[PDB]
From a paper:
We reasoned that to enable systematic design of binders to convex protein target sites it would be necessary to generate scaffold sets with overall concave shapes. We focused on 5 helix bundle scaffolds with three helices forming the concave interface and two helices providing structural support. The selected 7476 scaffolds, which we refer to as 5HCS (5 helix concave scaffolds) throughout the remainder of the text, have a wide range of curvatures. Our method for computationally designing small but concave proteins to bind to convex protein target sites expands the space of the protein surfaces that can be targeted by de novo protein design.
Immunoglobulin domain recognition plays important roles in immune receptor functions; in particular the cancer immunotherapy targets Cytotoxic--T--lymphocyte--antigen--4 (CTLA-4) have extracellular Ig fold domains that are the targets of therapeutic antibodies. The highest affinity optimized binder, 5HCS_CTLA4_1 has a sequence similarity of 82.86% compared to 5HCS_CTLA4_0. 5HCS_CTLA4_1 had an off rate too slow and a binding affinity for CTLA-4 too tight (<100 pM) to be measurable by biolayer interferometry. We determined co-crystal structures of 5HCS_CTLA4_1 with CTLA-4 and unbound crystal structures of 5HCS_CTLA4_2. The design model of 5HCS_CTLA4_1 in complex with CTLA-4 also closely agrees with the crystal structure, with a very low rmsd of 0.34 Å. 5HCS_CTLA4_1 binds to the CD86 binding site on CTLA-4 using a concave binding surface formed by H1, H3 and H5 covering both the CTLA-4 beta-turn (L98 to Y104) and hydrophobic pocket which interacts with CD86. H1 interacts with the hydrophobic beta-turn (L128 to Y136) through hydrophobic interactions between Y18 and M135 and aromatic interactions between H19 and Y136. S54 and I55 on H3 interact with Y139 on CTLA-4, and N89 on H5 hydrogen bonds with Q90 on CTLA-4. We co-cultured the cells with a range of concentrations of the CTLA–4 binder, and observed dose-dependent activation of CTLA-4 effector cells with an EC50 of 53.3 nM.
Author numbering:
A (entry chain A): 2 to 105
B (entry chain B): 3 to 117
Write the structure that this text describes.
Amino acid sequence: NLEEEVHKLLWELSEIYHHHDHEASHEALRRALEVLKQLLEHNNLEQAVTLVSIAVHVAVRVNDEHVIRELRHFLRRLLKQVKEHNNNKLALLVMSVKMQLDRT
Amino acid sequence: MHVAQPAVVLASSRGIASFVCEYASPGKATEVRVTVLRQADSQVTEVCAATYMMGNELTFLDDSICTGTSSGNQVNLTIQGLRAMDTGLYICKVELMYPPPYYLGIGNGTQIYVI
């Protein structure tokens, strides 16, 4: 049940962020990528915007260039889909995540 | 998560705008990160960002342009040094970082007008 997978990751990534935890991040980030990947395919953007947001926070601090690069690509697809539904809030939401990700 | 802010705000004769941004904090959270984005016209920039503990003053990263105070589930942000060019929609993004889980909420934005 994807909806729960996000629910666990939003808990886990928050504990990782606060706990500055470098290698719990690695596997949690990899799970996040795929959960985010599944959320894109099924057009569930509100989970995708929340999940990617905190995931980017963990990615930058831990400095996983692989995850950052993968997140650079997902953020671009995510933005595109959001624009096509004309959801300005979600676009502002995605772009602010893009800004911190784009150059840190 | 719902975030509320005034529809329109006018900068004083000395471009200092003040507006309150209220977030429906699930119960009570500890680490809150507030980000102010400016949208004008289709251009999106990050005006300021601060991580603060729910009831304290706001420790800003830029430590410029923006000052803020927090009281419960709401924060009063004060932006200085505004010129007419800086007129635009100032939107509040609020994140609950700790304790888990993470939450995210965006307002619909405050139209600030500078003379």
